Amino acid sequence: TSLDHVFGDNSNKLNYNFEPMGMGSLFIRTMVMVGVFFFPVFIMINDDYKYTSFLDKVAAAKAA
Amino acid sequence: MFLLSVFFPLLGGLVNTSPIARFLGHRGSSIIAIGCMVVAFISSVVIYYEVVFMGCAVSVDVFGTWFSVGTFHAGWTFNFDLLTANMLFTVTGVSMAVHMYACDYMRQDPHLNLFLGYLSYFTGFMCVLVAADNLLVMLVGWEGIGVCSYLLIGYWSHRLSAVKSAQKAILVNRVSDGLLMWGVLWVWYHLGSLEYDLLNVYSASGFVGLSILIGAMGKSAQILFHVWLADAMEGPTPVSALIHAATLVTAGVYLLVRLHIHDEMFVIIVGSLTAFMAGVFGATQSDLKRVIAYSTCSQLGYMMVSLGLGETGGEASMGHLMTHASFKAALFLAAGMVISGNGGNQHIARYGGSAHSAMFTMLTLMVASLSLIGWPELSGFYSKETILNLAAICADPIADVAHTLLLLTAMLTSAYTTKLFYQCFMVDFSGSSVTPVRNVLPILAMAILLLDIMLKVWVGTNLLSGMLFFLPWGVKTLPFGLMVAGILTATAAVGSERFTLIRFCGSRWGFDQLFARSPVNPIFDLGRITWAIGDRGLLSVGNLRA
Amino acid sequence: MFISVLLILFALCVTLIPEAHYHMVRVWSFVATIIPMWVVTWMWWNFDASGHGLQMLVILGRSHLAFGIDGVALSLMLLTTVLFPICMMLLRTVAGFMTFILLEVLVLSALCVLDLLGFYILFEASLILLFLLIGRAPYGSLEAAYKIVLYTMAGSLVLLPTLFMIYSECGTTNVLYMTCAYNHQTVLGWGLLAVLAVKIPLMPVHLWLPEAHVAAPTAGSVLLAGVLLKLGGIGFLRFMLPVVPEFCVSVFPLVSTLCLVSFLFSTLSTLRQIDLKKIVAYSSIAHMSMVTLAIFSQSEFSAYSSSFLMIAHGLISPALFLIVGILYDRAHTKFILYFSGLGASMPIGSTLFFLFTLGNLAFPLFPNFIAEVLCMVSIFAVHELLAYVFCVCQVLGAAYGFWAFNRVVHGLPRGPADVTRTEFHTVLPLLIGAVWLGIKPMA
Amino acid sequence: EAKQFTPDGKYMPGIFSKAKPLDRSTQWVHKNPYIEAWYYRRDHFENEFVWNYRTTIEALWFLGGFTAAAYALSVFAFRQADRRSGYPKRQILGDEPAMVLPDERQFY
Amino acid sequence: MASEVVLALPHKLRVMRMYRTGLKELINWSANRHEWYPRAYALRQEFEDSKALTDREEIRKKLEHGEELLARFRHWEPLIKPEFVGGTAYSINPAQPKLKFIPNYDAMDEYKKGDHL
Amino acid sequence: GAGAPVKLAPRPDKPLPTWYELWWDNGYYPGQPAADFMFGAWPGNMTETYYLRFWSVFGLALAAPFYYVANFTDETRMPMVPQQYPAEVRDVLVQRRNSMLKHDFSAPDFKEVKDRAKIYWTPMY
Numbered sequence A: 001t002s003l004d005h006v007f008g009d010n011s012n013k014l015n016y017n018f019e020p021m022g023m024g025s026l027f028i029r030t031m032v033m034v035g036v037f038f039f040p041v042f043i044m045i046n047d048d049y050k051y052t053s054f055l056d057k058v059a060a061a062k063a064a
Numbered sequence B: 001m002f003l004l005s006v007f008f009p010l011l012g013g014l015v016n017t018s019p020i021a022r023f024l025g026h027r028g029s030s031i032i033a034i035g036c037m038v039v040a041f042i043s044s045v046v047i048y049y050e051v052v053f054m055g056c057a058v059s060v061d062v063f064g065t066w067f068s069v070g071t072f073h074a075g076w077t078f079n080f081d082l083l084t085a086n087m088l089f090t091v092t093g094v095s096m097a098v099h100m101y102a103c104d105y106m107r108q109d110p111h112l113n114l115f116l117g118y119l120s121y122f123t124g125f126m127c128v129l130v131a132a133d134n135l136l137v138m139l140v141g142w143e144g145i146g147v148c149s150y151l152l153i154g155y156w157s158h159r160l161s162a163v164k165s166a167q168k169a170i171l172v173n174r175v176s177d178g179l180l181m182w183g184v185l186w187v188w189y190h191l192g193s194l195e196y197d198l199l200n201v202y203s204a205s206g207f208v209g210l211s212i213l214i215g216a217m218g219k220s221a222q223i224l225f226h227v228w229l230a231d232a233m234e235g236p237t238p239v240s241a242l243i244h245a246a247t248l249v250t251a252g253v254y255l256l257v258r259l260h261i262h263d264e265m266f267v268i269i270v271g272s273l274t275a276f277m278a279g280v281f282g283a284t285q286s287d288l289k290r291v292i293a294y295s296t297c298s299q300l301g302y303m304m305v306s307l308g309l310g311e312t313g314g315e316a317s318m319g320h321l322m323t324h325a326s327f328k329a330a331l332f333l334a335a336g337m338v339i340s341g342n343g344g345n346q347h348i349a350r351y352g353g354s355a356h357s358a359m360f361t362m363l364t365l366m367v368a369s370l371s372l373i374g375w376p377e378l379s380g381f382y383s384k385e386t387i388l389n390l391a392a393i394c395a396d397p398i399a400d401v402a403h404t405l406l407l408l409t410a411m412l413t414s415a416y417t418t419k420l421f422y423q424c425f426m427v428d429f430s431g432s433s434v435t436p437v438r439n440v441l442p443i444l445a446m447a448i449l450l451l452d453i454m455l456k457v458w459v460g461t462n463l464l465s466g467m468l469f470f471l472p473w474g475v476k477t478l479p480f481g482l483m484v485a486g487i488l489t490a491t492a493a494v495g496s497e498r499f500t501l502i503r504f505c506g507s508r509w510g511f512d513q514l515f516a517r518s519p520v521n522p523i524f525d526l527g528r529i530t531w532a533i534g535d536r537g538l539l540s541v542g543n544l545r546a
Numbered sequence C: 001m002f003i004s005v006l007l008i009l010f011a012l013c014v015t016l017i018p019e020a021h022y023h024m025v026r027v028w029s030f031v032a033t034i035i036p037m038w039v040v041t042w043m044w045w046n047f048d049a050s051g052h053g054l055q056m057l058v059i060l061g062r063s064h065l066a067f068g069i070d071g072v073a074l075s076l077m078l079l080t081t082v083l084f085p086i087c088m089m090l091l092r093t094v095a096g097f098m099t100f101i102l103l104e105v106l107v108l109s110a111l112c113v114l115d116l117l118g119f120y121i122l123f124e125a126s127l128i129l130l131f132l133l134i135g136r137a138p139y140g141s142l143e144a145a146y147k148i149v150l151y152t153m154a155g156s157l158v159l160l161p162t163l164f165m166i167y168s169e170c171g172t173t174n175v176l177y178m179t180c181a182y183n184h185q186t187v188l189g190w191g192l193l194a195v196l197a198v199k200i201p202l203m204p205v206h207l208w209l210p211e212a213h214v215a216a217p218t219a220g221s222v223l224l225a226g227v228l229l230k231l232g233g234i235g236f237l238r239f240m241l242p243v244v245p246e247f248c249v250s251v252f253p254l255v256s257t258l259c260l261v262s263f264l265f266s267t268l269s270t271l272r273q274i275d276l277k278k279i280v281a282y283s284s285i286a287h288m289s290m291v292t293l294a295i296f297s298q299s300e301f302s303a304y305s306s307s308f309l310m311i312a313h314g315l316i317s318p319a320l321f322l323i324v325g326i327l328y329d330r331a332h333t334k335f336i337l338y339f340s341g342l343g344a345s346m347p348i349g350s351t352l353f354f355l356f357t358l359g360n361l362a363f364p365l366f367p368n369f370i371a372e373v374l375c376m377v378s379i380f381a382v383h384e385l386l387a388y389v390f391c392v393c394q395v396l397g398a399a400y401g402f403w404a405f406n407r408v409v410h411g412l413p414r415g416p417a418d419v420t421r422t423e424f425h426t427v428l429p430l431l432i433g434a435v436w437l438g439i440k441p442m443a
Numbered sequence D: 001e002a003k004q005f006t007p008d009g010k011y012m013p014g015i016f017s018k019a020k021p022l023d024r025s026t027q028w029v030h031k032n033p034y035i036e037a038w039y040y041r042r043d044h045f046e047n048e049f050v051w052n053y054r055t056t057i058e059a060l061w062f063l064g065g066f067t068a069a070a071y072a073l074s075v076f077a078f079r080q081a082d083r084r085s086g087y088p089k090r091q092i093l094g095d096e097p098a099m100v101l102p103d104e105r106q107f108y
Numbered sequence E: 001m002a003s004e005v006v007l008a009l010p011h012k013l014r015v016m017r018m019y020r021t022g023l024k025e026l027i028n029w030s031a032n033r034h035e036w037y038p039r040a041y042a043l044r045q046e047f048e049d050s051k052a053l054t055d056r057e058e059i060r061k062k063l064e065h066g067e068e069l070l071a072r073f074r075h076w077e078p079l080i081k082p083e084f085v086g087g088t089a090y091s092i093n094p095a096q097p098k099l100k101f102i103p104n105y106d107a108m109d110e111y112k113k114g115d116h117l
Numbered sequence F: 001g002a003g004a005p006v007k008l009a010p011r012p013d014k015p016l017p018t019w020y021e022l023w024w025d026n027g028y029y030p031g032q033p034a035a036d037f038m039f040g041a042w043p044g045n046m047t048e049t050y051y052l053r054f055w056s057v058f059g060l061a062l063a064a065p066f067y068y069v070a071n072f073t074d075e076t077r078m079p080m081v082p083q084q085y086p087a088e089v090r091d092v093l094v095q096r097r098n099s100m101l102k103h104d105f106s107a108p109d110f111k112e113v114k115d116r117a118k119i120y121w122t123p124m125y
């Protein structure tokens, strides 16, 4: 306590309850994080879908 | 002479950190560090004249093979070509003056030889990075400068904010390092080799350029990765000069210029957004080192756009890198001298007059500031005007918006650099400590970088200097008018009453605060879930009481 | 074989030394583990790398117990013979010396056996030794010992009838004829997955490791981390992949998702740990998940890269356990809140801690960097996203590693003094091995 | 001010000596009771698990959710690898009899 | 609005803290000290125009409005002297506390320096 | 000036919170959160709602011009064609998807070169 009159004392305490985040906030932020940090997975899934729909068009208009 | 540019700063670091330094002390270690940088600079000068001017590249098999399993073959091999010679000349020349400065700036530090050894290791890993001929020895250099940046940013380890700044630099760069590693996997898989001369790509699979761009955006501190760069001011002033001039931030731009496998839309958009963002960020700061840090981020944005423009744009990007290193290191060294003359204060509201600094420090700040703002027929004028004129004739419609962003950024840069000079010297005194530094070593350190600024005007970086891209006088001389507008506004010292815009920009758009809870707190909470609910909960098997 | 009998009989003579001769007991038990290191180095000298896959064979009649050397077994045997004298330097009683001597006999014979029933007999004969080592009365934990023994017994009991099923199916448990006969691969594949997914910590059967690897003494932690986890990997590479390959293809999505969730969830748990030994203990699960996925990729040079990662982990994580053990031995706690400023008070120990922290995070000039690059080459060649998952999550490993280092090493200097000569020489062979295998591993 | 060595080496235990000998336990930490209590509680945190609303919801969406995401990604990668290698549809566990294990004597 | 510490103060010290923080925030928002002097004079004249009040409701309304203004205009980058908390020179190279030394620890009780079992 | 005074941080003298490892106590006063701005008052008293509200306008203010020029402006805005090359030099230069010579609307294979510069992501089989 020899420096409390120079740099401040220990009377003011931290205002935080150390509690977990709310469930909806955690879910929404995790879904945004999955979308941002795993964007090659969505890009490649979209590539597979766009490729298979073209083969569907070919197989549809070919056998007619 | 060729291997002396790479090995020998690493040797200086090894000497000054080992128990050999217990016999030399501070006094002997300063001599060892300065000599070990002078030799490497002389070697790099010889390499520069041989390779750039006489066009004779040299390839050295140094330590045999590193590892070779299947068709994945990594060798301990260097290659010294035009880009490598450019980078080696720049890195060793800047690091020599920074060592000469640091031997006097950190004189009163208790562990001076440890600091000098860390600086030498950082320089040597940068030399290893640019001298490598394949991707894996490049990754040695990449992670080596990352580790040495961690050691040097958090040098004053008893201060918690410095420790957290070093950890932040490591983590932000670790994200981009992961993406760069995945890109190296793509490149090797679809081309069959790791050496640069066998990596000629016309049309690749998109993930290659994107992931290598993300890995470069980490080190060059572009948008959504710039957050570590401002906090890296916790380290001492020589660390900041070497981070912002020659090492670390120029590595991603070097990698993109070397590979040339990007897709230009992402590169142009990222670079121009970064330039405008860092321009408005540096206009609203009062910490003397943070303004210079944001100007570094802005110029890296300029170089990013230029390498987006094309092969000529890639050459202009390397040219602006080379000329930027000299005046940026000079700016940081002059700012360190001004800080030491004012009792350690870094706020520009507590400066003024011409008593707290030497005449040479004020001259250094003035000349490097004039080169940065593109004053005509100085060093930065040639490279910055080349990039601006190349952006004014690109046939991509995206480059139309990028050019406008660059012109606005140029006006902002001439505003806040003139503000940095005005607050430091022109206004009345508002500090209380006048201890001006006039030692020989930091003055000679500044004089060397000013000589390099003159050298870039006298001898160009490449053949683009003097080539005329044919533009009307209105398009050509507009950046001069934007420089004058910034100077007049900053000397008038005018301000606006829109305080909510002022506090949105001065708080740097809240990127750190939004990152404190969009990935970070969720990572902590998901760890709580995986431990408490999973390991202790759902998967836990209890005992059978009897 | 005659040499192995002589080495066992020389090692077992520690019991007959009268206890009042302290110097002789120490020297005899240390030399009894030094000699097999020389013999295994000689076996590496004798190996013909352009010859057959199996060399130096011996088979003991109709008793199972057949032995042979390949590259994976030879590298793992070299690592074990390095690690056991360091364990001898960390013990003080004849009971400890004898437990580690019996463990060395069982590990060395299990690493190179070519019979499945012989592997079963040799490996889990170490169960009661591990129970007594972990649940030692004043300073161990009986809960941890019960957990590790019961999980291992559960997996082994799932395997044992399938072992006997293929034995009745073809007539032998020799791996050279088990790989050439027609067998019902789904049943035996499930039995082998059951043992080796407990030995390698794979979720959900992984909860024994955080208790056991922390409750163990420093020598026990060095052995358990650096050696005993890799018996699951050599189980995969020697027995399961050659004998049930159709199962090994069909189970790949399940093994793949187990490896991915083990890697991610164990990395997420490591961040919330507050015990230094528990921090070091969790980090091993993610590395073993990368090992298992690289083994199961079977794609480019998968055995090579996965064995090299096993060696790199077995060098780096025992050194971290050694540094935590020094801190616990001379400060009587393993709690992070009691340690700060260890750079000023233990500069050599903190430098070693930093170097092995960088090694554990797979930075270059350490064998983990080469290992993780080649493991991700093997994973990438099946699909690019299975490599991307490990690539993008590198910030999560560095977060816990640098957070633990920065919390205990910097700040206000409080804590014990720097390392002694003995502690430095316990650390030192691992550092030399790391520098060599990370700079010039091959010729 | 203890004396644990003779002038020619020869460690002395100092069992009956007045001065406190420096030894292995000299730098053992003084335990803070609340820190010991918090570490004990975190060591036995499995006694605090309860199936309330938040525990059930987070164990469903994160643990089961990401496990199902990883299984779907693994099957996607397996099928895409088999298509990009010239293979037909291959038999994973529970997938009806089909092709497993390509033949090396065959060109795909 | 004021923090829970300032709301617990006596009225005289509450007004004093409000004037002091107003002067400091005017320092933080100004370019120089010579810019700050007439703003300090204007803030002083602003407080002098409410000195002779007696109605506690009007006093409370003025006090609460000024505290809302000070919560609005809290600078994001305050000017702190470097060697104090929040400064750039705080906690850099402190003197080491006394750390104890054990001489010749390996030589004490040799042959019995492991872990018990 | 090495050896400056610094205030020490007190030890816990009350029961600890369950998730106490979100505070960084290094030994000196003051400690910090494990990540800055995760809890406690933000600088300038701003909040997350402030930044998200200002960004919900400012983000479209920055993304507006790029969209306009990428969808409503093309190669013909330029007063000149790109740099001209002999056929043997040009034919390798425009193989790069990166090249700015694909914006040559006077080339006889302008469309085919633009159709070959479409970015793909998954390499097909």
Ligand SMILES: CCCCCCCCCCCCCCCCCC(=O)O[C@@H](COC(=O)CCCCCCCCCCCCCCC)COP(=O)(O)OCC[N+](C)(C)C
Pocket: C044, C047, C048, C049, C050, C051, C052, C053, C070, C071, C072, C074, C075, C076, C078, C079, C082, C303, C304, C307, C308, C311, C428, C429, C430, C432, C433, C434, C437, C441, C442, C443
């Ligand atoms: C599956 C292959 C085995 C590879 C496992 C990884 C090994 C880790 C380290 C890599 C070193 C590479 C060494 C290459 C040359 C050595 C000899 C050699 O060829 O290797 C042997 C085996 O190599 C070894 O045993 C390497 C030993 C590595 C273990 C090192 C760790 C232990 C040292 C600890 C530290 C000691 C420090 C002491 C100093 C104070 C056989 O492997 P292959 O060439 O694949 O066999 C050929 C296959 N066929 C016969 C069918 C044609």
Ligand SMILES: CCCCCCCCCCCCCCCCCCCC(=O)O[C@H](COC(=O)CCCCCCCCCCCCCC)COP(=O)(O)OCCN
Pocket: B007, B008, B010, B011, B061, B062, B063, B064, B065, C365, C439, C440
């Ligand atoms: C904790 C981290 C510390 C970081 C340390 C710094 C960063 C290091 C990063 C890279 C480390 C690589 C070290 C490799 C060591 C030797 C490997 C090669 C072994 C060998 O036998 O090779 C021969 C040795 O040659 C030679 O070695 C040359 C012969 C002797 C002449 C030069 C002497 C060396 C002077 C170096 C000064 C200080 C430099 C500091 C790095 C060269 O021949 P080959 O068989 O490969 O054949 C091919 C070309 N002929």
